[PDB]
């Protein structure tokens, strides 16, 4: 990954590749992107790593949800399938410990 020079509203320069720091310095205005940034910051607070994973996974999930909505599925069906698959993933994960 590559570092990004981010200058905030106070002319302070940040050179980092940490996703949480980049999102914090960026002035995100869209409420949905604000919610995703909140999720990333919560992941940073709880664990301390994996914020970029959270962001990219949420983006991919929402893109594929848009595809499913376009092909004819409803929001409720997509949400139910996502929850079922998340439960399946959390069940599978302990078996993947090496």
């Amino acid at each position: 990954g590559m570092n990004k020079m981010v200058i905030n509203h106070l002319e302070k320069l940040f050179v980092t590749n940490d996703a949480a720091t980049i999102l914090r310095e960026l002035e995100v205005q869209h409420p949905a992107a604000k919610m995703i940034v909140m999720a990333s910051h919560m992941q940073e607070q709880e664990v301390g790593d994996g914020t970029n994973f959270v962001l990219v996974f949420a983006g991919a999930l929402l893109e594929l949800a848009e595809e499913l909505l376009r092909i004819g599925l409803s929001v409720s069906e997509v949400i139910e399938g996502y929850e079922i698959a998340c439960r399946k993933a959390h069940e599978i994960l302990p078996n993947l410990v090496c």
């Binding site: 590559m2 990004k4 020079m5 050179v15 002035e27 205005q29 992107a33």
Partner: protein, 528 residues
């Protein structure tokens, strides 16, 4: 691009990404390097920068020039930062760091334009820097003799080399002897605040002197000060932090009396308190009294009647230097003025120095401090003299820490370039091009020396390369003879840590600049 009714980031957010933004960063670093390029070498020049208020600063020091420029480019600020870092850690070479970093970026720019992955460039830079630092440590010349004469010669040569680029280069031997004398008197920490530097207008550069003791300017004498003698031949010095004047005993103190006798008693008690303090000071045997706090007119006249010298409102640093020079202790109370807390000096005198009176404490045999009194024709003249002396002092301190030297004038960098080229000739070939570019970028300093001196840099560089290839580690640029010479035998000596830190900082800055692929600028808040 689409309007996107609700935008992601707020309006005014500017984003630049990809190869063009990194090429722009390299160009900005080139501009910053060019801003200080001409101030390198014995044939370097000075830059004059005027601030908003109208005051001008004239300097040859690269760090000062870079600080005075209001650089706002995020990538270009890294060069200023590494210049500051080199100034802090070493104190000399603040131009070479910027030149080397910009040359690294310029050399790797063509590979950036053709799509080479920045991680490969960063890895090559790290490998080349590690190899160069190891080579510098291996080939640096040190003497395992601990000879006082040899150490003195080494320090003086390093100081002259550090000084032979400034306006005081004509008196470089004299100033270097002064600097080495001053540094060698510091005890073990080599604190800079133990070397006072006073600038007095008027006089030639050769009129500047180093006081083996402490000297400071006269501090707002009261009435009756001119009635005091101004020379003592073995004075005991009372270093105090005491306000010697009639005043309220306490800020919250209140006096309540109901008799005129008690009123007179209170007035006499205030006078008696002041006179008791003065008598305790006088009975200690001291003839010179210095205080960090104001000394009133009553105390001044009292000391004049006793043929004693007084000076109030002395700056704290001057009192600390006086304590270190004489051997007393700053007393906040005069109740115990034993002989152990009184400073001693052989001669105290107040003399005239260019329309300004100065107090002199000389003859101190156990002094751990000095005081430079610089003479010049203008404020900026003396400021630049002080900057040059600071560079020399830092160099001498670092050499005191370790006496490892390498020949200057680009000789060390030509040797490093030859070594790195030889190493790069024996690797697969993707890293070979980048290490060769690093070695070529190492040639900027001798080329810049030749360009500043007005030579033909190409022929001198060719001769240097041929000499280094066939043997001879310390062949650099001979500025006076417009040729090449053995710079180690010409006593163009630098501490090895100077070039080590220069290479490390330049490589780190280049890697940081290369590693950035996107720049985002949030809109300004509270523009007012």
């Amino acid at each position: 691009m689409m309007p996107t009714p609700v935008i992601l980031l707020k309006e005014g957010t500017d984003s630049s990404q990809g190869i063009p933004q990194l090429v722009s960063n390299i160009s900005a670093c080139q501009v910053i390097a060019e801003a200080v390029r001409t101030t390198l070498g014995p044939r370097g020049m000075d830059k004059l920068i005027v601030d908003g208020r109208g005051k001008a600063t004239i300097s040859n020091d690269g760090a000062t020039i870079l600080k005075l420029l209001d650089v706002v480019h995020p990538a270009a600020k890294t060069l200023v930062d590494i210049a500051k870092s080199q100034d802090a850690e070493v104190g000399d070479g603040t131009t070479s760091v910027t030149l080397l970093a910009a040359e690294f970026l310029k050399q790797v720019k063509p590979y950036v334009e053709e799509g080479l992955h920045p991680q490969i460039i960063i890895r090559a830079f790290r490998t080349a820097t590690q190899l160069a630092v190891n080579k510098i440590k291996e080939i640096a010349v040190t003497v395992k003799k601990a000879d006082k004469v040899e150490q003195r010669k080494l320090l003086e040569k390093c100081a002259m080399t550090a000084l032979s680029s400034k306006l005081i280069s004509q008196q470089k031997a004299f100033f270097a002897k002064m600097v080495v004398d001053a540094v060698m008197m510091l005890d073990d920490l080599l604190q800079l605040k133990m070397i006072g530097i006073k600038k007095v207008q008027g006089g030639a550069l050769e009129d500047s002197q180093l006081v083996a003791g402490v000297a400071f300017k006269k501090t707002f004498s009261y009435a009756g000060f001119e009635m005091q003698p101004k020379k003592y031949h073995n004075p005991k010095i009372a270093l105090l932090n005491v306000e010697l004047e009639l005043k309220a005993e306490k800020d919250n103190a209140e006096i309540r009396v109901h008799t005129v006798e008690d009123y007179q008693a209170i007035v006499d008690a205030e006078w008696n308190i002041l006179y008791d303090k003065l008598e305790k000071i006088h009975h200690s045997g001291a003839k010179v009294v210095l205080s960090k706090l104001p000394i009133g007119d009553v105390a001044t006249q009292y000391f004049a009647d006793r043929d004693m010298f007084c000076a109030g409102r002395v700056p704290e640093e001057d009192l600390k230097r006086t304590m270190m020079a004489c051997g007393g202790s700053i007393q906040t109370s005069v109740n115990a003025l034993s002989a152990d807390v009184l400073g001693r000096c052989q001669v105290f005198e107040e003399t005239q120095i260019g329309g300004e009176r100065y107090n002199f404490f000389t003859g101190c045999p156990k002094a751990k401090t000095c005081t430079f009194i610089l003479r010049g024709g203008a404020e900026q003249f003396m400021e630049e003299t002080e900057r040059s002396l600071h560079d020399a002092i830092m160099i001498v301190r670092r050499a005191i820490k370790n006496d490892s030297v390498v020949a200057g004038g680009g000789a060390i960098e030509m040797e490093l370039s030859k070594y790195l080229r030889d190493y790069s000739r024996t690797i697969p070939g993707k890293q070979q091009l980048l290490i060769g570019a690093y070695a070529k970028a190492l040639e900027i300093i001798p080329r810049q020396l030749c360009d500043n001196a007005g030579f033909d840099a190409t022929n001198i560089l060719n001769k240097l390369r041929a000499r280094h290839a066939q043997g001879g580690t310390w062949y650099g640029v001979d500025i006076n003879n417009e040729d090449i010479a053995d710079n180690f035998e010409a006593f163009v000596w630098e501490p090895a840590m100077v070039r080590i830190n220069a290479l490390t900082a330049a490589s780190e800055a280049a890697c940081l600049i290369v590693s950035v692929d996107e720049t985002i600028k949030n809109p300004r808040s509270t523009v007012d």
